Write an enzyme that holds these catalytic residues in place. Sequence first.
Site, PDB file in Angstrom:
ATOM      1  N   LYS A 241      18.130 -29.322 -17.672  1.00 26.59           N
ATOM      2  CA  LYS A 241      17.927 -27.990 -18.220  1.00 26.59           C
ATOM      3  C   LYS A 241      16.644 -27.337 -17.724  1.00 26.59           C
ATOM      4  O   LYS A 241      16.289 -26.258 -18.205  1.00 26.59           O
ATOM      5  CB  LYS A 241      17.927 -28.045 -19.747  1.00 26.59           C
ATOM      6  CG  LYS A 241      19.288 -28.351 -20.342  1.00 26.59           C
ATOM      7  CD  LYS A 241      19.192 -28.660 -21.821  1.00 26.59           C
ATOM      8  CE  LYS A 241      20.547 -29.029 -22.394  1.00 26.59           C
ATOM      9  NZ  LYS A 241      20.784 -28.399 -23.718  1.00 26.59           N
TER      10      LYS A 241
ATOM     11  N   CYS B  49      14.084 -21.642 -27.457  1.00 26.09           N
ATOM     12  CA  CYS B  49      15.426 -21.108 -27.630  1.00 26.09           C
ATOM     13  C   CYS B  49      16.424 -22.252 -27.711  1.00 26.09           C
ATOM     14  O   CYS B  49      16.210 -23.325 -27.142  1.00 26.09           O
ATOM     15  CB  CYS B  49      15.814 -20.168 -26.484  1.00 26.09           C
ATOM     16  SG  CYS B  49      15.325 -20.752 -24.849  1.00 26.09           S
TER      17      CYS B  49
ATOM     18  N   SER C 158      19.909 -23.966 -30.346  1.00 19.17           N
ATOM     19  CA  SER C 158      20.329 -24.224 -31.716  1.00 19.17           C
ATOM     20  C   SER C 158      19.231 -24.865 -32.551  1.00 19.17           C
ATOM     21  O   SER C 158      19.145 -24.599 -33.755  1.00 19.17           O
ATOM     22  CB  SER C 158      21.566 -25.124 -31.724  1.00 19.17           C
ATOM     23  OG  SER C 158      21.259 -26.411 -31.219  1.00 19.17           O
TER      24      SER C 158
ATOM     25  N   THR D  22      20.878 -27.606 -26.634  1.00 25.43           N
ATOM     26  CA  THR D  22      20.361 -26.303 -26.130  1.00 25.43           C
ATOM     27  C   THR D  22      18.893 -26.104 -26.490  1.00 25.43           C
ATOM     28  O   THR D  22      18.311 -25.066 -26.186  1.00 25.43           O
ATOM     29  CB  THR D  22      21.172 -25.123 -26.693  1.00 25.43           C
ATOM     30  OG1 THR D  22      21.352 -25.292 -28.104  1.00 25.43           O
ATOM     31  CG2 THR D  22      22.530 -25.033 -26.015  1.00 25.43           C
ATOM     32  N   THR D  23      18.293 -27.104 -27.134  1.00 24.28           N
ATOM     33  CA  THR D  23      16.910 -26.992 -27.578  1.00 24.28           C
ATOM     34  C   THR D  23      15.951 -26.973 -26.396  1.00 24.28           C
ATOM     35  O   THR D  23      15.845 -27.957 -25.658  1.00 24.28           O
ATOM     36  CB  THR D  23      16.553 -28.144 -28.516  1.00 24.28           C
ATOM     37  OG1 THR D  23      17.395 -28.101 -29.675  1.00 24.28           O
ATOM     38  CG2 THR D  23      15.099 -28.050 -28.946  1.00 24.28           C
TER      39      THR D  23
END
Lengths: 204, 204, 211, 212, 208, 230, 211, 195, 195
Positions: free
Chosen positions: C33, C128, C130, C1-2
């Site tokens: 992403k 945004c 983890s 999720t980085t």
Amino acid sequence: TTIIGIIYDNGVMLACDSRTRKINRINENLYVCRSGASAHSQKIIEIIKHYCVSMKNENRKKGRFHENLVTKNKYFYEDKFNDYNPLVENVAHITKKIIYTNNNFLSCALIFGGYDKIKKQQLYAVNLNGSIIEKHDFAVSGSGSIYIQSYLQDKYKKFMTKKECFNLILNCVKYAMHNDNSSGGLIRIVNITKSFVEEFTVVN
Amino acid sequence: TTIIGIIYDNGVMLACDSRTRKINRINENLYVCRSGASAHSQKIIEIIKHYCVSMKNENRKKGRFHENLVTKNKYFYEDKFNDYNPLVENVAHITKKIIYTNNNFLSCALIFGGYDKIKKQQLYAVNLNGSIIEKHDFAVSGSGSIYIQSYLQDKYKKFMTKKECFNLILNCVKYAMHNDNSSGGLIRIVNITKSFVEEFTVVN
Amino acid sequence: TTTLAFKFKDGIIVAVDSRASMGSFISSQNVEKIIEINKNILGTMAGGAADCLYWEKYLGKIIKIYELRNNEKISVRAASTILSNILYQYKGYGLCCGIILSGYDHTGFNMFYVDDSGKKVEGNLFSCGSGSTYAYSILDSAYDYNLNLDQAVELARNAIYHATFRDGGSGGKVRVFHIHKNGYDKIIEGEDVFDLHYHYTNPEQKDQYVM
Amino acid sequence: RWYPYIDNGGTVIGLTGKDYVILAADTRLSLSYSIYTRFCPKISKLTDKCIIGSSGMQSDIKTLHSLLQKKIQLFVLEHSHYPDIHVIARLLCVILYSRRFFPYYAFNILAGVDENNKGVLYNYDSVGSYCEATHSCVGSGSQLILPILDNRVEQKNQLIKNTNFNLGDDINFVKDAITSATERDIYTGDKTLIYVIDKMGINVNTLDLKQD
Amino acid sequence: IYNYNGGCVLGMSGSNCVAIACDLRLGANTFTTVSTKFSKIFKMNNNVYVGLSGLATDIQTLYEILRYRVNLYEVRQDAEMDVECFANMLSSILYSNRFSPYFVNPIVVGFKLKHYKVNYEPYLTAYDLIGAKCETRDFVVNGVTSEQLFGMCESLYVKDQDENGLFETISQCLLSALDRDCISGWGAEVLVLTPEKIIKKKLKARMD
Amino acid sequence: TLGPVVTGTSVIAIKYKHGIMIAADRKASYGSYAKFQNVERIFKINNKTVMGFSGELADAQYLHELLTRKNINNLSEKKRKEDMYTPQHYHSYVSRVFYVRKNRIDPLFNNIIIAGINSQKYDNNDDNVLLYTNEEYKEIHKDDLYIGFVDMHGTNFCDDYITTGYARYFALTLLRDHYKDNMTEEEARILINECLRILYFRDATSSNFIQIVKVTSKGVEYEEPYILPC
Amino acid sequence: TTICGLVCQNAVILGADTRATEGPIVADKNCSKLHYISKNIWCAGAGVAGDLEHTTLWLQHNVELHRLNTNTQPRVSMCVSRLTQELFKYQGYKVCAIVLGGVDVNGPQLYGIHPHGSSCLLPFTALGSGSLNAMAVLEAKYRDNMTIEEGKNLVCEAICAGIFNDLGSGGNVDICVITKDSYQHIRPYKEPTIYPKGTTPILSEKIEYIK
Amino acid sequence: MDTLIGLRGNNFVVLAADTYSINSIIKLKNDDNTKFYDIHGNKCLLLGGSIGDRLQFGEFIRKNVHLYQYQNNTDMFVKSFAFFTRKNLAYYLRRNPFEVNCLIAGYDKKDGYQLYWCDYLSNMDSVNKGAHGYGAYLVSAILDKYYHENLTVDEALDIFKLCFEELKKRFLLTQINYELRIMYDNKVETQYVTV
Amino acid sequence: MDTLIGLRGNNFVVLAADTYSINSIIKLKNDDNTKFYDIHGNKCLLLGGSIGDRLQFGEFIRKNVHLYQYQNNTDMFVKSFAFFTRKNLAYYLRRNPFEVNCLIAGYDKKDGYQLYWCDYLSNMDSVNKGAHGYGAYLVSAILDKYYHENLTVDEALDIFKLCFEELKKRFLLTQINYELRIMYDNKVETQYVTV
């Protein structure tokens, strides 16, 4: 609460206690006994009485046709031959539908007794939720009846006379009251026959 | 589970179903029938059997004295005159104490039957928690018995004969099995008299 | 999720990983992403993948409608406001979307951060996921305006590498895009972090790297 | 106080080649610890060059497949061409996200052959997210087989490497993987269906597995 | 609870050769790796090894207890402990704390000695957190990545094998299993023990 | 609606030569009370179709009402014997109803069996239908018979034999071990009797007063209730 | 797991499957459920494997000690008593439902022990996830005073059907025959790619020769 | 809540900790001295968490180690110190939880300069560097980037300055004052830094 | 969490707010601008709480006020502004909660310079000075001590500097940067301060 109903030859009997008048007169030849929540039972009784009046008016034809103490009262049927009196099955089934559509909140057990020309004397049991079963021998409901179940099963006969059914139902209700702790008071009994209905109460 | 005990003249009878042997022989003249949690009742039965053996050995005097299918088994008492056999009241009361001291966990209803020289045939009922009541007429326990209660109350007599009590208890158990959904199987019956005990099983 | 995005002299740099997890198990190692919302606007994904993807594409459709209607390119601020309003309409429903909308409009180069709780913020450096904290730490420590494009891409790649290094939920491949006046270019479509680690921290392949 | 979600269990496998795709699936329907029936296919044919497999609530996957087939048929009727695999994938994503708050308990794999004769596999999640891949697995055996496919296809952590792969080898590898899942998993199944999509139509074969 | 400090341990048998491999990650709060040297395999006897996976504190406590007990037994008897005895004592120790137990899933790997010359037989076993011993005679797996390791070993196991083939197979299976787990990995270590010698190697695993 | 109160035990349906045979005990338990011991738990939708029951009684009665009136509507607009709905039709209809109710989180605490003949080339009963009032059997290919199951969550399927309730463990085992193909009526009845005896011995909610119905080329036949030989 | 037990003509027969599960996955494909208490008593259980193994070992060793001290053939009733008190002491939290079969001076017999400590003597029984199916077939075909061959055939029928029906049970079928003198244990009664050397990469190695 | 940082390298060890005593929503002091515990010899223990818990545990461990050293007339080894602390922490965790995070550090003639991480569950393990508290999330990565073998003390202090600046600029709880404990050349030196 | 301060005196009003955008445990920005909303004319609205809620409510109120001002071609009074804001906040609280604390400030030719406090429950009332957020606890008393009638703007800024120093020195979250909005002499000035 104890509710019992017995089908004897040419008629039917319904008996109840008095603790908290559990027999209600839906029609001259149609009675119902209620057990469980009082408010729900009363509201459903009023609704079904409304419906019964509606159907009784609707199905009327057009022209002319057919050319201790045992205090008791007798009522002769006004509608001879049951020309327009609603069938007991229709009343029982509409009550079943009403209970079913609101089974999430409605919680009450009913026993319907009455006489019809098509199918003679009848006895229906509407249980919790929308469950309806036709009983040919007898019906029982309430906490008290559980104590007399076997007793009834032992002393019931296929074709009983009026006095035999009288005594059997009276003893059943008395035993239920004696054992059950939530049933008491004077016993109310109603006899529905082909051409009249007689209601009495015993204070023993 | 249905458990019945009836006191007739010169003897007593206990009856049970078989569904999940519910009668246990604590002593040659002392039987107990159990309802409720299986493990709890079995442990309590072992404990009271141990206690009963202890007391029976303890109270022995010193010197010489007194100079469908109905398959059945008969056992004659080894101790004539009940010189040292423990009294039924003592066993019932010690069981009551054991249950009471552990009533926070123990949950089982027991009925004790037996014959004693002091008080003749006896029936005791130990309910949930430490409540012991001596029944002179009859005792009933289990889910099934609730259905036949009234039946028994109607057909019980002060001084019944062996055959009368046998038939009554057999019919009671049969009705309890018929109505209740958690009772069934072959019926077991034990008759305890002043000089012998006979146990028979009915497969109807 | 980085996710990562920062603004510098020659435009904007955007970087992302490629991991996807269903808990303790990684469903897919190669996912996209970065979405081309417009010819000049990109938006990253963080948190709920499906919600972010669907709402990004819906925002793209709305932007297309508006641009075709009025005959003028939309501004990043307007897209951010629209996205924030739509996400806020679903407050208290379970959406876990975190977006970084970055693009060039008639006003210049713009970046915005949007959250499922309608948290619209404007800045020149965002991250945004983890592993966001590690990326922030390695950016602020060495980030500086007016550095050449090569330094910018190297810094972004290093930040993503380190974020994946200390994050179970971040890894896979590093994708780095560059946004300038006329659209954007994909500097790095995908780079396996394996050789990346074995080139950055443990250049000598002898003995385990102890940290 | 009623939970409207039960996992019927099972496994679906998908692999891609240069110009073909292979999609295998179990044929067992089961409950918590008992099996309803030994034959309930999970692969529904969408078009002549596109099929879908699913794992999860059997009713949900049946309804989803029927609804997607209806949508595809309506599209063909009102537009006069068969939708491509990309169109079907996006439409499925939209359908799945429609129920964002009462999601289908269905994990989906969409296999097909593009208009350029390229094997395409799309793997989804229960709520809508999807991504293209060269190999995928869904159902109970996902965690079990996915490493096997990863080692076979991507072939990382290896130095010699071997990328010479043809249709027969891929089919045999898929059969081996499904047999391994059957051996080492309880919900896998007993009879498996293997669909092969190639430039010249599609074909289906059946293989027999263990019954435990 | 096991996600906190996830781990993976594996073991395989061959022809007069055994192998045990493990991951080298120590994390915190699941998604935060803290160290990359925490080894899950501890040598308990010249030919007996135990691989523990789970909470790190529990791992250390159990390892210390086992070392104490094994040293005591070995000194008292003045001879090496047998793998059977070690496995049984491990089961007993694990069960001793059935309530409030040790949150660790260990596996025992080593050689069984058949005296008569002498023979070495591979011995493997895996346990639950209560001590649910279950012999398997082939590959053993344990950790949060148990499913992936099971699948890989089922697909790749080749029955008895030369030590080189055993090392290759175990390393490949472990690397494949770890690559599909997020809370485990960060380097791997492999031990190949045989009667003549013992080889310890570390793999060039995906360290991210 | 909110939970079972009065429940049935189980049903067993199996297809054999000349049609299908479905059996069920005549009892409805009120928890652990066994209030009613004479209840018809096998209904009829039309010729070549019957509906099973194992669950709450009210929901079964409501579903029976729905299905019978759907059949009435079908007949009202019927012109050829091929217009009658097949067992597959009713099975799909009930599956859709169950799925909708599940999506609404108000299921029917039932497990329905819909069994019949989905072929019209064997008899001419449906050309002149008779709802009120009511030769040799013709062998039926197993492909022309249909039995379908429906679960609370809408799960459904078809097979050669289906059971519900506790019959899914005992009777299912017996059938899978011993069930044959194209077995005469006597053998099918023997197998059903064995299954129901096993259930009677190891099922509190069961009973030995049994109703057995047959769907064949002659239509739907309600055999006289009999007590299990035991 | 599927355990079954039956009493045959002056003999006892126990049967079990050989599959153990760790959830939705099968850990060992050839586990051993049957356990040896004495030369004429055996048990087979379902539940927590650790509890079952520990309780079985404790019971076996206690029975052996009692036999040695008393110098009399062990009695199955004693084993029951011990297990019942042990389980009842622990409030039933050691969930392990056991089938105990033996042949003492009083002849063959079978006991079912339940987690809460209750025990019941039976002529035939079955426990486990597949208990229902095995018991169904047993009751369908069981008869009194059978023969050892017929007993073993029925024991398969039971366990084999349980394997074929229930998902939690599978593998081979183990059988044991207990007689007043001697016993038999038929463990397998019925039973219904290499990588090139140097493929994997390494970055360290050290050979230590064992003394 | 309480930020601890530790960096170990050849012939040097460094520990850093913010100086704050939080009570409710205010700071009792800006010069907290309850975080560092120096053991006789070359050994330091840095605790983070509840003030009372760390006080109790640190006093217990330090005085027990002093008792050992006086009774046996020697200096406890660093590894022995760390593992004794871990065992005590695990024991109390099992009976009476100690919500405290531990950073042990020291110098030994046998193992050289060494440092040890320890979670509040006693998840202890040897490490070349580490951090504790929420601020850890903002420093660990930096420590990875600038750390390299053959480091010097000055470079370590520069890295610590970078970490302090990062906490001041980006960390929710803006931490400004820090205390540093440097162990090297058989000397333990204390410094105070304000960013 | 977000500190707001307001001081009203004869012929001057002052608002103050820290500039911070908190997300989880990190600051998105040190130059937040979502707290102040200037209405056309002499009117300011200061909002504290969750970023999204304050953004939505402030934009709504500001644009409704602008709509009224344009459609009626006048300048809405400060009292009307404050009570309209309170009514809207109460309405949404009863239907959809806005966890937002409010400070309305303004100048009117009728009532002079005024302030208005408002809690997140719409517990609005006119005050001569007030605060919002945890920092209020550490500053309100100070405002009482140094406030006196006939105050001048310079003394107001001195009091605000004292409040900022106290918040920096004693408040858990060491807030450093503050933004000031000064309304006086029919002018609005914006200032930035760092303690």
